[PDB]
Amino acid sequence: AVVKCKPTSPGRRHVVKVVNPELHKGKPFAPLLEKNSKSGGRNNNGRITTRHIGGGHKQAYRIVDFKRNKDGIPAVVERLEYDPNRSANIALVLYKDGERRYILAPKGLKAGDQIQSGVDAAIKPGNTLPMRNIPVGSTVHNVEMKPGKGGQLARSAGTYVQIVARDGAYVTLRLRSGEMRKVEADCRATLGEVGNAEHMLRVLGKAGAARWRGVRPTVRGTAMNPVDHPHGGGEGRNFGKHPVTPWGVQTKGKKTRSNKRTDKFIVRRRS
Amino acid sequence: SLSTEATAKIVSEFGRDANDTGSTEVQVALLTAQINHLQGHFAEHKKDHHSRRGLLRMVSQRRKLLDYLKRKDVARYTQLIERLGLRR
Amino acid sequence: RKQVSDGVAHIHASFNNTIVTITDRQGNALGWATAGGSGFRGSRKSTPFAAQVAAERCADAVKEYGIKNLEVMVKGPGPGRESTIRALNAAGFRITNITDVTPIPHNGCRPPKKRRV
Amino acid sequence: PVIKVRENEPFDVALRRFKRSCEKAGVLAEVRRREFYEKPTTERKRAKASAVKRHAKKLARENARRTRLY
Amino acid sequence: MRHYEIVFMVHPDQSEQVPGMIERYTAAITGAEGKIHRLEDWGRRQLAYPINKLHKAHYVLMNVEAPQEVIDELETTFRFNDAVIRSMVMRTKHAVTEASPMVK
Amino acid sequence: FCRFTAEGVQEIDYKDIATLKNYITESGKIVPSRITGTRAKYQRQLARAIKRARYLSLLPYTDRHQ
RNA sequence: AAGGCGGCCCCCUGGACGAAGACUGACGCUCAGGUGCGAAAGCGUGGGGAGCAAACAGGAUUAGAUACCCUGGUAGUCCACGCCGUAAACGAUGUCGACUUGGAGGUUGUGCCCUUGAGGCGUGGCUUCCGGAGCUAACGCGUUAAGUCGACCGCCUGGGGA
């Protein structure tokens, strides 16, 4: 539920919270946690590779089942939890044999529901079965690209992928970007949309809410010197040049894909 | 509307003769049953304004029947709203 | 030249022009002629004479394919709605079928607005 | 209007039957009706004037059947 | 309970599996304490127009007095089975039992 | 001279195809009640049954589509 | 109830009418303020977007043509949730009840006669047209009144300005 905050102060004037009362108000499941050390956007050479990253709140990593290999064994959904590592909420499920795991929470999933992986699984939101067993035209998420590798597509808070076709070993997908992509028909997929669809409805309100998320401020390029950026310089506000990267690459429109290995898997590009 | 068995179960519950079917408490409890049954309908279907007009018709009719019962005999009015759980 | 025995005459009779297309029973087109291509323009090409010479040209253009039997699909309202199949008989073709295949939606897409003339 | 020419049938016969069946199924007036959009005001107005034309002409024909002219 | 008239149209190459579907559906209803009133296989029949790029289908009529929940489950069974092409359930005022004009 | 008024049926059956074929034209259009003299109650039942037989491919929607 | 509602199927659901009875026993009518619904266009957020199409562009027409005509075409039209709260939102006729000559239909029930056919005789609801008395400035309305009466409400007071 989105809640507009009352303007008792600037910085609360424009804040929209996303309040979910179903999330667990306690500590997460400790065995499935591990350390997630921050980087600062710096590689093994110590240099900043990706900019604007730094700071933020400490985050523990939640081990999430994307491979979804417990076939045949049904599982009940114990509780829903918050994951700082990702936009979607996670679900703590309990298998019959006594194993607990974290999955991505689908849209309509709640505490007490039954999920089941495997080929003979039913078709309800939460089940994971190969797309040669999934009917054409359904919305799935957590989609594998390779069989047994683990789900890589449609993992963010409100996403889903439509299955538009199937030709033998392959199925054709309608990705969230609008791209039509071929995937082998033996790759697993999980039914339904991903949960937290109103994640994009939040408004941070203030700069600190981005510094909480580890997003350092972005200096725009024309506010620099010509040694710093191609856009820099000028006596006043001058920009008499085409918009490029900090490294002199055109940004407004120029394509950058140069992978001829996967061009056979792309049916149509996005528009 | 309300089903036939639930109607006859109310009629036999609050009717002096199990066939009066038009007494003031019978018409009130039949309205209160259909109202409380349609709380779930309009909680799910909030845009069913055409059915909601029939619901408000039931409420206004129950209120007129209650006000008649109040000035005709108060003790039946108290026993009625106490048994049906009516705030007024 | 490949001989073919049976054929289909598609007739696209609009208000402004009539298009005659001889094809096989598979839709692989054999030859075509239009009323505008029959030496007529503007007011002359929305006439039934323009269509019966577009049909005479199209039969001359499918002369070498050796067609003797022909069925006719007719689409659209126009003046060459009938005089075309008149000349297509008069070429010396035994007519077989005259089917009307004008597209009629079941209240589908919205037509354009009315001409305030 | 899929019309097969019967064996040893003239073409003007089969053509007149095809115009007959196309006028029966009502195609030309359908396309002329669907060439432009007609508002539901204009459609309700044309249907009301068609019914009033049907009706005042039925009463005028039956009343005019009675009285003479010379 | 609620009298339904169910007619479904099976892919004709799966005509052999038809009595297995009928026996499962009948055992679904009577397992759900439902009655079955009429049950008429109509065989292969030429379609009026080609569904799914094919011209014939296998028809089954069934008149049923079942609760609506298992009928909604049966609709989902028709929905996810690709052998059945079309399914139509029409609610009826009463239970009909007389034979169809095309079973004759 | 309504036939359904004569025979006295409570509801027109969509399965009676030879009847519904006596009430549709060659191009699959529903024949109007002006011609057959059908009472408009049975005309509504007939159109509601023809639209179902069209859904079940027992009757065509038109003569052309294939 | 009005706005309005048009393939088919299911689920939930409101209202009307009829037939015999049974029951309560005036419990009714209207309604300022109030509350609710309320076409299209429009606004906000999030989607969607085939066709149509304000704006706009080009072509013509013309004395000119920021238009009609043509070729394109964006918001919009569609969906969800909110807001707006207006129309020649019209029957230009407020709601409820009673009485007052007729005719031809349409629709929807229902009763009776041997249904001796889809008929014959009735009795209810809704609805269309004509028209009598009466009314009205006239046009016309005319048992669904703009006739004869009763209850309550809303409104008008020369044209502009507004």
Ligand SMILES: [Mg+2]
């Ligand atoms: Mg950055």
Ligand SMILES: [Mg+2]
């Ligand atoms: Mg920025």
Ligand SMILES: [Mg+2]
């Ligand atoms: Mg900046």
Ligand SMILES: [Mg+2]
């Ligand atoms: Mg500087």
Ligand SMILES: [Mg+2]
């Ligand atoms: Mg430089």
Ligand SMILES: [Mg+2]
């Ligand atoms: Mg300067």
Ligand SMILES: [Mg+2]
């Ligand atoms: Mg400059």
Ligand SMILES: [Mg+2]
């Ligand atoms: Mg009631």
Ligand SMILES: [Mg+2]
């Ligand atoms: Mg045009």
Ligand SMILES: [Mg+2]
């Ligand atoms: Mg008494």
Ligand SMILES: [Mg+2]
């Ligand atoms: Mg008021």
Ligand SMILES: [Mg+2]
């Ligand atoms: Mg609108």
Ligand SMILES: [Mg+2]
């Ligand atoms: Mg909008």
Ligand SMILES: [Mg+2]
């Ligand atoms: Mg939008």
Ligand SMILES: [Mg+2]
């Ligand atoms: Mg578009």
Ligand SMILES: [Mg+2]
């Ligand atoms: Mg235009």
